[model samples]
Target chain A: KWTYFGPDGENSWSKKYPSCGGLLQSPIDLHSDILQYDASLTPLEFQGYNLSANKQFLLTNNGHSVKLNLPSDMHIQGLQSRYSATQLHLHWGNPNDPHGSEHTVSGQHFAAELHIVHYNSDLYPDASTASNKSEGLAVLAVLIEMGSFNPSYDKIFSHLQHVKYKGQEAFVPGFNIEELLPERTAEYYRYRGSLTTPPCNPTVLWTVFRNPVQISQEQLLALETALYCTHMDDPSPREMINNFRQVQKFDERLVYTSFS
Target chain B: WTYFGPDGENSWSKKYPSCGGLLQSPIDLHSDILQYDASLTPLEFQGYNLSANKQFLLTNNGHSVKLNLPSDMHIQGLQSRYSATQLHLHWGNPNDPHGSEHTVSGQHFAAELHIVHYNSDLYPDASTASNKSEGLAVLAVLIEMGSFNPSYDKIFSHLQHVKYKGQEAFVPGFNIEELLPERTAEYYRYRGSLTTPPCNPTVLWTVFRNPVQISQEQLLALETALYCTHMDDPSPREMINNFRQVQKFDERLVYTSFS
Candidate 1:
């Protein structure tokens, strides 16, 4: 359904769409003023519904494939505010190797991009509200590499039947979303960019974790089941078929990250 | 002669007095809450004496030396005042071979230290008065190692004839002071402690540069000639041997540099 028209300016999103609109974009650079941030400035904190483990939610698989109960207060950032964890999304590449990541760091693109959206509470009250404009959201884009077996991802995969295909819904049980995240959060790179879809909203404040999560090739295909089909009446394009946008020019924007 | 004997804490300096009163002590460990004179906010344009080289009197010496000559201003929450020039000193080890840079980031300190002193300009106007204690200052400590054909100690040896004990005169006329410097001022660092004697006035700030210089063993011997032999008096045995002290412990202070 999608074709990468080389690195030349010819691409589906650009050719088919109007000029770049209000969508927040990526590759944000960092610059500090001669005036340094006061080290004594207060740190911001958040309080939410019961995020405590064990008391939260559960995923179980006995026979009916698997079922997951996502919490109502599923935390995510406002596309424009400080970092807040919202919902999770997947990315796919061309072949077994070429198609993964949507955004490239230093020209090196991963196999897929896992966008974990958050909202800066300083700007937006929640994630959905952030998409209303480009300045209200902060999206944490994480790359997923195709390699090795990951037992942790198996928990999320088990619930594929629960929310398969576009718009399908289910409310089986509730669990702590924190359990699904990686251990390290101290470092990351940040930028401003648009969403990966047409009408690509430039309202996103992007932050990409320096570390990538590793999952087997099979795990990636599992999420691919939700890809949109070429001719809706016919069969659906495989999940890996069309899940990426061409790399946009970084222009003069800078991407800033912590020490490697 | 000064002997730091067992239980000889009080007698060390009290017994034989020198010009310790005049020496500027290093800024020791302290948090953000103590002191006064800080501009409540980052002041805009602290007059930097810009020069014809297109460099302000404050410059970034690519190897970690960065100096920002600050003009008078006030900010809240910041306990300290006075703008300072940041410069780094390098070091290497002889016996240990592990590097003498106390705070890491891969620096060495074999057996010598570089002392970078910043002019206390916080209260430059006060200079008109006799009170010299009310300004900002910095001192950098760089270590050294043993290398052959080293020109590191050349200056020290050349100035031997002038090396009197307690030789406190700032020798003028040598172009070497301007010549012996690294080229860049951009640096990687944080707010930290001073590694010197009178260890913790804690006002002395340290700014280290990135690159290093190569000095010959012959250059290092000059240090012996420049050494201060009699600190306190003719009788104090400890003399002026190692005026440097141990590094202090500072917690949670983040390291930031001019971007």
Candidate 2:
């Protein structure tokens, strides 16, 4: 019953989910004052990102955001352990106020955001099993801004109508997942944080790319207009807008950046 | 019941009449509302440096982290001798860090510290002076996130001990004046009411123009370390955003120490 607004908003989230109030939370303000450049944080190798065009992925409306289920074959290398892709979802604001990125840069919000969730395959069998464990997950975050049309993102956005309502599903043809990420993937801010959603476990190692990807205003409008948080035929249908958590505090932790 | 939700700041006037009355506190300090007053001088801090061996009672007042200051710690340079009674803070949540009661232009600072003093010359005690004219004065320091501040850490280090409402902790006394921002001469002087409920419009407010800095970690501790609910309370509400919003100026002009 937890939602992003009234009676069951984020302020009341801790009432049911204790971890939501716990420390090391996610979506923090990545301001310059808190960012530390670390030389050791080298670029990660994106493995098996180019999915076969013939293969199909499941795109679902999970009442929160449109999530495209990722495959285990798509993994990230160069970390302490191997991490397999679990799912990749997005967060965005309504057309009127398109700045809906979860993490902010010096209190500035982007048009949208994308999180590529991964599980530590080297230590755990699946994302569910690893979700609560230390070093369990590593999310690659891409800040999406409004600009030129993004064809790579269209691979999934094109299927939005099929999964317009909560619990609805659609088939998404495979495309190069790496294409969704912004250029200069080597430069990113790294930190240990929790899931932005409920069951907010402090088990994620976040890698937010410093550069931003662009999607045309028209595409952004399409993404904004295409989804619903309510089930089909529900008495009250709520548009899926501003599906991003507020930035949490940067507690006793430093955000190491790959670039100065 | 007057928590910052369901029954928050906007509804405070329903219970405390003065909250909605004339000359309400915490107006935005900006060029449009500010006037330089040459008569205003730097206030002297007398007996602010307490003995390090001496312990002070720090408690979670359910609304904020409060420290019971000694009467000897007072502010001078005003018409009356204002003796210190206590000090507390108002801060934003981990989600939204901007929560100072007073705002600059329209934006709020990260947090605010209030050092409460009563006009001992005019009244016997703060309680007796609570509702009287020219009975109180408060010193406020706005806080921002920056390099780690050791001075603030003197009090923030003990925050974990008073994690829940009504919880108590003992902190070794330090120079209370260190808590204020640098360049004490530059400040905003005004007449306003107590921001809390049962708001009494009898105090003089001195809000420092220059803000103090605390590390992001220190701010996080302040925002997340405490609970508004009692220790055993089933619904534990994190004590955050415990700050009043800026009231309408209503033709009131804020006087400043420096131009």
Candidate 3:
């Protein structure tokens, strides 16, 4: 019932998910003047990211996005409580206009964005249980733009066709998950906001990398058109694109940067 | 039909996500939503009054009757320079008339005219500028039925030529600004989207307070003159009531140019 477009879109989500109408929304514009430098905001250490190529990971088209499930062994450091990886997904615009990254810089959007979701494994058992509680979820957001072909991003993109329709699933041999992250990961903007989707539980700690990674235009086209938000059997299915949320206004919310 | 009904506006969000996004266009300009901003200086319409020597292309785009304008035409007195791209109209049918997109105190006008322009200073062309942030600026005029407007007739007279979808005709250019109302300075300014699909919320809108007049006969002709479908098709769809319904403005202020 919750589609990105139509009556069931983002604006109407509050009707069903009351928390969506609640405070501190995600995907805000990371612009000038509003940004503050925080000395305490440190570099996050990634653990167990280099998954063995021999092993396999589950990839599913959850209708909103194409997600890759990660083992709980993949946890992040530098936060108050240790958060373990649960799943990661990508958001993008259409092939015609490719600039649809969720979090923008100075009101400008990148071609796409990748969010690696983590839950407070120290306190909660699973992502479902932690998604609503305070300081329960953490997400590492990577901004993507069009440039040279990225072999690393291809690991997930190559399997998009297999899970093209909603409720579809496929498998991909595990690779170094850290390859999807930007090289300059230390430089980032940190804030507290809700999930970008419905039931937008305001519990995630957002980390938007300052530097952006590049994927060729051809690869970007694939990412924009390779999936659908509709089931294959549906009579009138729409192309899954422009899946990113609009930039939310930051009221009484301060954005912290690792770099001055 | 890109119209009102089974596959109309409400269904637009299914394909164009931005249709459901914030900062939507064609919002009703009424009392409670109005805010008088003295800072909104009068805009300068450069090259708007075209010469007789030039001719423009008028096409039936299956959705609306569109007249392609040259890049030289533009609007000034804004942060960015917006060059003219094209002009189009939206209206109701002969039976159930009055289909202007933007309403005044819940009152609907006979029709509406959109003079579209793109940010020339930042973007290269209208196609490229259609979706970027601060990319477009559109001038809207409310059309009411009263007198026969020769200025509007210059374009409306050619409707018979481009009646079928994709059909195009060359319209001789004239003093384009004559199509606007008496007072151009008094307007409602806001940020909105293209009233069409892939509804990019990148437009800076200036909807004039005063409405221009057109004859009732002219309005009737406009309502029944064209077909949205092609001539070759056995089943033809009439191009009537092509305007999009007003969208939610919510929390956004609509600044007025006058006191």
What DockQ results do all the predictions give, each relative to the true complex? Answer: 0.01, 0.06, 0.05
lDDT of 1 by residue, B134-154 (tens): 333343334343334223332
lDDT per residue for candidate 2 within A203-251, as digits (tens), equals 9999999999999998899889999999999999999987887665453
- How many angstroms is residue A149 displaced in model 1 relative to the true structure, after the best TM-score fit? 2.6
lDDT of 2 by residue, B1-259 (tens): 4444435554455456666566677776766567899999999999999999999999998889999999998999999999999999999877567778887765578999999999999899999998999999999999999999999999999998999989999999999989989899999999998888767889899999899999999999998999998897888888987887555453337899997
| CA lDDT of each prediction against the hidden true structure | 0.38, 0.86, 0.86
Compare the candidates by TM-score and give the number of the best one. Answer: 2
Candidate 1's docking class is: incorrect
Interface RMSD of each: 31.5, 10.3, 15.2
- Between candidates 2 and 3, the TM-score winner: 2
- Listed per model in order, the count of residue pairs whose N, CA or C atoms clash below 3 Å is 112, 0, 0
> What lDDT does candidate 2 reach at residue B172?
96
Between candidates 1 and 3, the one scoring higher on lDDT is 3
lDDT of 1 at A31: 24
TM-score of predicted chain B, candidate 2: 0.97
Ranked by lDDT, top first: 2, 3, 1
